[PDB]
Write a protein that binds this DNA or RNA. Structure first.
Lengths: 865, 834, 166, 50
RNA sequence: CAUUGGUGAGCAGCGAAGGAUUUGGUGGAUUACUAGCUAAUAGCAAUCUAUUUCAAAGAAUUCAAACUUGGGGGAAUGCCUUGUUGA
């Protein structure tokens, strides 16, 4: 389903899933396009870097992919998508409803074999163009002609022909005429793979029992036959660097190398890939190189290289065995735990059910590395017990990392499935650590935590005992015994003062930590299965058994929220970094998001696989989830970091929903109120002569004398909106009736209507230079009419208690500009009447004066004495 | 409390790279080293983006919608930022040194010059969500032979004009259909083509080169085939062209040369409109407004930024920062400007909110070591390495006192009395503490008794006792005033740098070279408690040192500490790149901040890349300064054993990352740290981080507005406080009416009182309801102003931002109206007759 | 960095000069390297002098003369910014041009600057030796080749070869 | 200058000079740096200096 | 009687088809993941060549150019500038 907070980003942690990959040769370098569920991934075979991932996920899983030079053809449920640099260039719907499952490209033709033994041929339109685009013909293989189609190949120098490998026969079609040129004899057993050899007109076939046939498609014979008993052959490739070897690959997970010249068997790599996930699904020699790329279903892509011979004269009979070159890998089984290792959202620890703990990198997939399990030596000199043949640890149930002391001592503390002690790990060196932390009540570890100083690590056992170890030395410091059933969560306050434990007897225990006491104990209504603490807001959430989340703050020991709405058990949940939301994922296939301020549910996602883990990134950038099926960590981005999401409750006042409050323009009309603008407009308008005299350069700029006079006017055609670029709209007074400025016209019309509201809007609109220039030229000569129009404009304006610092600075600009004429023809009736009613409204501004006097004198007395 | 995000970067208006204006030419985007600062010049305020390159950035653009930014550093690592959300979209690594990046005019494409390839990409959508790889390639063009130096799009986004280091400049069309419209190259120059521009109607092309020619290219006949019709020359001999721009609407060619001189021309005529000089260092950057009325220049060497309107000849701003030189900082008594004492010998008073330097003071002949305010914002004392403690009156901008010793020693720390009678200063080569009076300028006495250089001094702001601390592992408490002349020595474990005094003068916390912070009581001189601070320090490995960061003893201590203003926390930093803040009552680390993630600085990485270590030395120790294009940076003027001298070119080594002084803000919950990149300013905003205070199940936003609609105003306000959501506190605070302000203000409980005081403070600094906020302040101070008086240090950073609202906006408004009242009274009460 | 390659006058020895710092004098048909030195500044060009026994390198600014096993023998105080070195082997003269516009001949036997010649055409872009008469052709930024001799303080000839530089 | 930058500015200062500097009477708006704002608007000479 | 000194001989304890110490080589990381080459709006990648040539554009009295020198004293012969003499 669609969400609104989280949008899917990428499923990290996948390398391959056992679809046979494909290899493409740009120039003289090689890339390797591998399928990972529903996308492909292009790898740079010289160093196994991840170049491209395909842009849009296919509707169903990519079932067969191949690649020419720049283009990658990928076949899923019905159709073939022709991609280039990941971005899809074309999409070829086949005209059947059966699934396409093989494809081959040669010349103009794209040949797509479906599973009803039908073959669809596509042609280039005009043979310069880049990918085959038009429908050409359809071939059909009946039951009479051959068996089930198992591969579709084109072996070279064969003019518009196709070799179709059926399960019992090897057909040869002409694809221009649609003819069946040749049909071989029946093979005594079922051929499971095929591969065109670099010798001319020879294919290599490989059967379900261990036979490798060298079929000469122009004579129709088999040239030779190799037998690998009780082995099911799943890949074939040839060497082309000037040695004549063959690499067969067995679904038991082996890779066997044959010197075809002297019929020897060179080497056999045993258990190169796991049999239980498919064996080796593809192996191929990068041509002209002695390196071979293999890849299995175990989510792994390896390369192996043949070093030059050790014998300096013979060489070809002393073949040194293949060694290991680079390799990428991931988890083979879907992960069980997930943690973000650092606040930069760079690394994440992820622990799976194949009992490996990896550290995956969000920023570059070639930094992923499995954290090693090679143990240290014991401290005293005793022998370390355990098995001799090594195996991995039991699979990880919990882990807790506080990288405040990272690189000094151990950093991760982890809790494995059904064993009575925690382990430590070192994240900087990426290994296990020197300490295991025992529970000392003979009970399995149910929960770990560690302090934010990185000094203490807490173990909560399934018999109710919280033990507190040091991390640097690992010696048992303390042992709290409050719960009598299992302790399923521990956490400690950010200043190491109050720790909180929750167990599935249903009591939450609040302990002081410096003193050893408990402050309190809270009995809930259900057993508790998981606790997530939020350390800056001091609020922890407990996922109960009656399908709720109980948000409770640690300072006062109150349940403060209770989020209901889950129809099944909460598998995981995690706070937002700012402490505002909480994302829960539960066994009803849903992922909800609860705005805990408002209490309700913001968001709901119905996801098909049940998300077993949810983690917000420690800066609120990503959400990483982990499902029941799929070896990757599905990463989402929250869109509420680039937009704003509404906190409106879903199922199945726009300001308070969007968490804003745009402060209203003025609260009451009897209240003085400044202007919505810069604070510095008053000081700039009062002092913009001496400010600009500061702003002058120190000496005159050396200009040119042959400079046009009307240079400011000689522009072209980003327009200028200054007062000097003013145009008149549509019998000699200073400003005629064709030459009237907009300010003078609005002043005069407000003088007619006795309402200068549009005038005051205009003055508050334009700039300090234009304000100075309009108050500067106000017709101060014969009746002083425009001056008293400006005076009662300001009187009407400051009567309304808005913008009043602007109305007082406009009056100062008037008194400073031509208060000499107001002083001279003082005793004029119009000027004295306008100034008397100005003072009549202005005398009531001593409210602000004795208000700031009281606040200043009292605040200074209160602050000092 | 402790969730400090990066807020601002004062100092360093410009470091390296291109200056950009917004579309509406209000903000200018200026590259500080790995950040990007945005100065809004109209609403006088400024910020700095939180993201960070790993090297000093070199190219900038944002599209004409103002909606997303792209910044590239000096090896091609671009970062795409959503602009209005201030949150980074994508990181894309172009593989080689990108000279310029430029959006389209219509917005949908951009194009950047990576070496000899002009590569055109198409812009992602801002409203599309994030992808794995949002950039789709349009094309990659190779026609040039050497590197590209510039791009210029046409008006309609159809052609693109690139200028190369190879002596030509080519014109390329965006789509393949018009390949035959743009197939020409423009030869003929003698040196590097530094710019190639279209005219307004795209029928002329002006190509300006490095040596100082500008060619005019027209499509005439001698068919028609793009002749050059005219050549104009700048005739600047020893200088040569460093950065060109051309605004084609107003026909304005602005050129900045390699001698500070910019000339600006009207181009088809080539008449010198103006010619003047930024300084003496070359002009690295010119940009022009979209209306063409403002020009912004930048010189990288002193790090100075101009914007200059040229119609009026007047500098809109002419500022200059400090890279790798800030010996101290000090907030003003209202935390509104930071006064910075810098190694080139000068004091600078940086406004915080708008990131520009108000005044500067240069009367010290040599480096300034310490700055400290006194007499509550009127004077500011500063002590320096030339042997002077000199006082500065910040009202008449004058140096009204100079105190010298009779010994001519260089002072490295100073401390002023509360009532600024006495100024003391202590050196690093004398062991005495020189005590001068401020009224009579004489030396009052010289306190002796330390047997090591007096590393740090402070005066207790309440009982006026002098705590000094010196490298003889000894802190020492002098009662100076009032017949006593008493000295009290306290021994400590290792040699003290960085003493700080508690705000109430009861205690004093020292840093030590073990990397510990020991907090002593003064009256009973016992150790009240220490913090062990050497393992929570990020000491990097330098490029030139042969010992690991785990084993380096260089910077595992704190050389400057400061108490919080309530007295419960300590911020600290040193010559390492972690600034740590602790709380003293639990003695634990609240938070540790990384001051820089730059690799162009030295002490950043703990773990250096072992691809750079070769069979002879690291690869970042080879001086590739003889591969440079021109002599003025081929010169090696770095005389040998120079550490911390002057003039960064004279050092040969990468600048280390270091913090020299930290300070807690006196008004609003912030600290500032004087790093090498600049004054890093960290503060908490409460728009984010839901952090409630004892709420319950029934206290909700909807429940608060329901109690507000049913008008229980006290219930609604304390429900807003318990949610502690700022928009709810604001909404209820503006819904209460004036008649029952004083009832509500008397009945707010005693615990929510500092909440409402700090809210009214940081609200009323900027909001326009002046009479409302003064009504609230008068009600609160009259209601509960005995409680504030007896819990002084609790309300000491909340009441001090109230009188940053009264005396800085409200008293200014009252001064304006009082001026209007007395001008009215004089203009109507007297006789202007003839 | 990019390696400037010079051979001896017979085919015996090779002298490579990396742009970052790496100079090496070697026998390229034996496997014998007989000097390898990482002078941490940006070296430009290098030549042998009269044997495989001495070689002159044009470093960041000063030209240095090293002996067979790489020990520094001389630091030339003149030859301020060499970029192009050459050797006149019958006349025993190390010829040098660079980012100064000066051409300098240094007599290698006695140790004496025979001539400093103002090219007067800015930095020298190319420089070759005419092996028949040992006049040096320089190539400037005017597209002017100029034939020089250490006797005359002017070019013997000035050729207008190309447009742009050479 | 170059002795101090060589000596890594630990040095010892020159003694003293009772010089004489005059100052004209000018607004402290004009004694500032170029930015949109200002910091003080008094005059650079006191009442008693006037 | 100490050794918080060397060298050995043995217990207790640790203890799953062995354990300890040192070392050569290679691989992945060590910065944030958009593929190779070239004459590049496309070719090639098995190849650029037997279309790779023409046209057009293109030449500052800047016909100026060591911002590049360890200090004191000189400079015959040079070299630089200026004057001059004869052509």
């Amino acid at each position: 389903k669609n969400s609104k907070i989280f949008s899917p980003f990428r499923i990290i942690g996948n390398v391959s899933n056992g679809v046979p990959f494909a290899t493409g040769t740009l120039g003289s370098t090689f890339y390797i396009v591998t399928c990972v569920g529903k996308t492909f991934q292009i790898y740079d075979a010289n160093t196994l870097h991840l170049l491209f991932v395909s842009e849009k996920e296919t509707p169903s899983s990519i079932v067969a992919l191949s690649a020419h030079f720049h283009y990658v053809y990928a076949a899923y449920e019905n159709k073939v998508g022709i991609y280039k640099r990941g971005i899809e260039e074309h999409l070829l719907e086949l005209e059947t409803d059966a699934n396409v499952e093989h494809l081959c490209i040669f010349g103009d033709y794209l040949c797509a074999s479906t599973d009803d033994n039908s073959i669809f041929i596509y042609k280039k339109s005009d043979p310069q163009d880049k990918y085959p685009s038009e429908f050409y013909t359809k071939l059909t293989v009946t039951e009479i002609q051959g068996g089930e189609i198992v591969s579709l190949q084109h072996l070279a120098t064969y003019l518009n022909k196709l070799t179709v490998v059926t399960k019992s026969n090897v057909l040869l079609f002409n694809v221009r005429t649609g003819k069946l040129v040749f049909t071989s004899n029946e093979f005594p057993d079922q051929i499971t793979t095929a591969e065109p050899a670099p010798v001319l007109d020879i294919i290599a076939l490989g059967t379900v029992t261990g036979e490798v046939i060298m079929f000469n498609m122009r004579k129709g014979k088999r040239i030779r036959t190799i037998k690998i008993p009780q082995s099911r052959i799943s890949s074939l490739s040839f060497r082309t660097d000037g040695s004549s070897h063959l690499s067969v690959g067995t679904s038991s997970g082996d890779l066997i190398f044959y010197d075809l010249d002297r019929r020897s068997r060179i080497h056999v790599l045993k258990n190169i890939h796991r049999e239980s996930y498919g064996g080796v699904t593809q192996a191929t020699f990068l041509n002209g190189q002695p390196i071979i790329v293999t890849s299995g279903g175990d989510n792994s892509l390896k390369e192996y290289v043949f070093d030059p011979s050790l014998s300096q004269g013979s060489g070809d009979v002393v073949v040194q065995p293949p060694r290991y070159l680079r390799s990428r890998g991931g988890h083979s089984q879907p992960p069980s735990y997930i943690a973000f290792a650092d606040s930069q959202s760079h690394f994440m620890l992820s622990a799976s059910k194949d009992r490996s703990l990896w550290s995956f990198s969000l920023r570059k997939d070639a930094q992923s590395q499995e954290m090693s399990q090679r143990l240290h030596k014991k401290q005293d000199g005793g022998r370390v017990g355990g098995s001799t043949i090594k195996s991995k640890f039991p699979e990880i149930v919990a882990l807790a990392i506080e990288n405040a002391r990272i690189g000094e001592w151990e950093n991760i503390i982890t809790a494995h499935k059904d064993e009575k002690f925690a382990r430590t790990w070192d994240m900087r060196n990426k290994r296990v650590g020197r300490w295991t932390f025992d529970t000392t009540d003979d009970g399995f570890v149910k929960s770990v935590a560690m302090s934010q100083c990185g000094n203490f690590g807490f173990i909560g056992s399934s018999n109710g005992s919280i033990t507190i170890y040091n991390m640097q030395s690992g010696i048992l410091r303390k042992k709290y015994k409050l719960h009598k059933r299992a302790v399923t969560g521990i956490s400690l306050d950010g200043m190491n003062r109050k720790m909180v434990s929750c167990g599935l007897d249903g009591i939450v225990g609040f302990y002081d930590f410096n003193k050893s006491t408990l402050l309190g104990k809270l009995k809930l209504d259900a057993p508790i299965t998981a606790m997530v603490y939020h350390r800056s807001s001091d609020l922890f959430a407990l996922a109960l058994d009656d399908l709720s989340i109980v948000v409770i703050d640690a300072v006062t020991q109150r349940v403060v929220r209770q989020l209901w709405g889950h129809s099944n058990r909460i598998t995981a949940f995690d706070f937002s970094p700012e402490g505002r939301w909480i994302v829960s994922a539960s066994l009803d296939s849903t992922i909800r998001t609860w705005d805990l301020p408002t209490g309700g549910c913001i968001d709901g996602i119905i996801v098909d696989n049940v998300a077993t883990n949810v983690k917000f990134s420690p800066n609120g950038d990503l959400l990483a989830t982990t499902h029941v099926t799929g070896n990757g960590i599905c990463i989402w981005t929250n869109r509420a970091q680039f937009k704003t999401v509404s906190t409106r409750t879903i199922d199945e006042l726009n300001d308070i929903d969007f968490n804003t409050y745009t402060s209203l323009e003025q609260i009451d009309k009897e209240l003085l109120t400044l202007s919505i603008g810069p604070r510095s407009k008053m000081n700039t308008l009062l002092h913009l002569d001496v400010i600009r005299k500061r702003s002058k350069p120190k000496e005159a700029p050396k200009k040119s004398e042959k400079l046009p006079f009307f240079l400011q006017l000689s522009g072209e055609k980003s327009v200028r909106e200054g007062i000097a670029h003013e145009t008149p709209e549509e019998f000699k007074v200073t400003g005629r009736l064709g030459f009237e400025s907009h300010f003078t016209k609005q002043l005069r019309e407000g003088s007619q209507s006795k309402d200068y509201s549009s005038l005051l809007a205009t003055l508050i609109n334009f700039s300090p230079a234009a304000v100075d220039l309009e108050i500067r030229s106000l017709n101060s000569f014969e009746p002083f009419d425009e001056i008293v129009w400006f005076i009662d404009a300001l009187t009407q304006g400051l009567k309304s208690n808005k913008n009043f610092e602007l109305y007082e600075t406009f009056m100062s600009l008037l008194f400073k500009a031509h208060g000499d004429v107001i002083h001279a023809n003082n005793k004029n009736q119009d000027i004295a009447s306008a100034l008397q009613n100005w003072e009549d409204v202005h005398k009531k501004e001593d409210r602000l004066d004795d208000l700031v006097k009281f606040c200043m004198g009292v605040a200074a007395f209160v602050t000092t004495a | 409390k402790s969730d400090f995000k990066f807020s601002n970067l004062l100092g360093t208006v410009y470091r390296q790279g291109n200056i950009t204006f917004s579309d509406d030419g209000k903000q200018l985007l200026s590259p500080v080293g790995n950040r990007v600062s945005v100065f809004d010049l109209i609403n006088n305020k400024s910020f700095t983006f939180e993201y960070e390159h790993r090297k000093n950035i070199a190219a900038i653009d944002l599209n004409k919608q103002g909606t997303l930014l792209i910044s590239i550093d000096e090896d091609g690592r671009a970062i795409l930022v959503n602009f209005k959300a201030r949150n980074v979209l994508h990181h894309f690594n172009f593989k080689e040194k990108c000279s310029a990046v430029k959006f389209s005019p219509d917005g949908r494409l951009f194009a950047l010059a990576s070496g000899r390839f002009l590569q055109i990409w198409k812009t992602p959508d801002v409203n599309k969500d994030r992808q794995f790889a949002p950039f789709v390639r349009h094309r990659v063009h190779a026609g040039h032979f050497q590197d590209i130096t510039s791009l210029t799009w046409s008006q309609d986004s159809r052609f693109i004009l690139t200028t190369s280091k190879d002596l030509s400049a080519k014109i390329w069309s965006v789509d393949s259909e018009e390949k035959n419209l743009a197939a020409t190259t423009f030869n003929g120059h003698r040196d590097y083509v530094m710019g190639a521009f279209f005219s307004h109607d795209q029928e002329k092309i002006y190509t300006v080169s490095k040596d100082g020619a500008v060619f005019v290219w027209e499509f005439t006949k001698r068919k028609y085939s793009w002749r050059i019709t005219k050549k104009h020359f700048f005739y600047a001999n020893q200088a040569k062209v460093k950065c060109v721009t051309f605004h084609p609407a107003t026909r304005l060619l602005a050129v900045g040369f390699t001698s500070g001189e910019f000339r600006l021309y009207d181009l088809p005529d080539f008449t010198l409109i103006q010619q003047l000089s930024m300084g003496q260092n070359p002009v690295n950057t010119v940009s022009v407004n979209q209306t063409g009325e403002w020009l912004a220049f930048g010189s990288s060497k002193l790090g100075q930024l101009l914007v200059y309107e040229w119609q009026s000849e007047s500098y809109i701003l002419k500022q200059q920062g400090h890279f790798d030189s800030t010996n101290s900082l000090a907030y003003s008594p209202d935390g509104s400007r930071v006064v910075t004492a810098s190694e080139d010998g000068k004091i600078k008073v940086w406004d915080i909110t708008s990131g520009f330097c108000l005044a500067t003071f240069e009367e010290h002949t040599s480096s300034v070591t310490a700055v400290q305010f006194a007499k509550r914002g009127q004077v500011m004392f500063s002590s320096s390495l030339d042997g002077t403690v000199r006082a500065w009156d910040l009202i008449r901008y004058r140096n009204f006192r100079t105190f010298t010793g009779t010994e001519r020693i260089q002072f490295n720390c100073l401390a002023v009395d509360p009532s600024g009678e006495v100024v003391c200063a202590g050196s690093l080569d004398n062991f005495d503490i020189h005590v001068w009076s401020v009224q009579t300028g004489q030396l009052l006495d010289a306190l002796s008794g330390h047997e090591g250089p007096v590393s740090c001094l402070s005066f207790s702001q309440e009982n006026s006792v002098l705590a000094s601390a010196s490298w003889d592992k000894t802190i020492r408490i002098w009662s100076i005033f009032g017949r006593s002349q008493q000295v009290e020595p306290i021994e400590v474990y290792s040699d003290v740098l960085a003493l700080s005094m508690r705000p109430d003068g009861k205690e004093v916390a020292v840093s030590t070279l073990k990397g510990q912070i020991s907090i002593f009581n003064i009256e009973d001189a016992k150790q009240v408690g220490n913090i062990d601070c050497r393992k929570d320090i990020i000491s990097g490995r330098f490029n030139q040192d042969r010992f690991t960061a785990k084993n380096s003893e260089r910077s595992k201590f704190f050389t400057t500490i400061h108490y919080s203003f309530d007295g419960m926390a300590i911020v600290a930093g040193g010559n390492n790149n972690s600034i740590c803040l602790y709380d003293v009552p639990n003695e634990v680390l609240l938070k540790r901040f990384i001051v820089s993630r730059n690799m162009a600085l030295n002490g950043t990485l703990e773990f250096l890349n072992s691809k750079k270590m070769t069979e002879a030395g690291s690869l970042d120790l080879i001086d590739d300064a003889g591969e440079n294009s021109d002599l003025e940076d081929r010169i090696d003027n770095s005389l040998p054993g120079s550490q911390r001298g002057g003039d960064l070119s004279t050092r040969k080594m990468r600048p280390e990352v270091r913090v020299t002084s930290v300070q807690f803000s006196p008004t609003a919950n912030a600290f500032a740290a004087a790093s090498t990149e600049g004054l890093l300013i960290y503060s908490t905003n409460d728009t984010i981080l839901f952090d409630p205070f004892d709420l319950d199940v029934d206290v909700t936003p909807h429940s608060t507005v329901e109690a507000l609609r049913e008008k229980q105003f006290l219930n609604a306000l304390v429900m807003a406080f318990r949610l502690n959501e700022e928009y709810l506190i604001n909404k209820v605070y503006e819904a209460i009416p004036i008649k029952e302000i004083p009832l509500v203000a008397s009945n707010i409980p005693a615990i929510y009182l500092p909440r409402i005081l700090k809210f009214i403070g940081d609200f009323a600094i900027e909001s326009q309801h002046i009479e409302f906020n003064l009504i609230w302040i008068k009600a609160l101070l009259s209601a509960s102003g005995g409680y504030i008086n007896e819990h002084k240090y609790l309300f000491s950073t909340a009441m001090r931002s109230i009188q940053r609202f009264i005396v800085r906006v409200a008293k200014e408004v009252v001064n304006t109206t009082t001026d209007n009242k007395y001008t009215y009274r004089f203009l109507v009460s007297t006789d202007g007759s003839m | 960095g990019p390696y400037h390659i010079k051979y001896a006058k017979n085919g015996t020895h090779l002298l490579i000069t990396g742009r970052k710092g790496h100079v090496a004098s070697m026998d390229w048909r034996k496997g014998q390297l007989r000097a390898e030195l990482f002078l941490n500044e940006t070296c430009h060009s290098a030549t042998y002098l009269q044997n495989e026994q001495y070689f002159a390198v044009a470093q960041k600014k000063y030209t240095f003369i090293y002996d067979h096993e790489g020990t520094e023998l001389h630091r030339l105080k003149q030859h301020i910014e060499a970029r192009h070195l050459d050797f006149l082997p019958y006349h025993y003269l190390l010829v040098t041009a660079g980012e100064t516009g000066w051409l300098k001949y240094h007599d290698v036997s006695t140790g004496q600057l025979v001539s400093e010649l103002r090219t007067k055409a800015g930095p020298t872009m190319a420089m070759a030796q005419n092996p028949w008469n040992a006049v040096m052709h320089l190539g400037h930024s005017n597209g002017t080749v100029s034939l020089w001799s250490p006797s005359m303080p002017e070019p013997l000839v000035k050729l207008l070869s190309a447009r742009g530089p050479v | 200058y170059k002795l101090d930058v060589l000596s890594s500015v630990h040095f010892v200062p020159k003694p003293a000079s009772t010089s004489l500097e005059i100052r004209v009477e000018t607004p402290t708006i004009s004694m500032e740096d170029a930015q949109p704002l200002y910091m003080s608007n008094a005059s650079s000479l006191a009442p008693q200096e006037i």
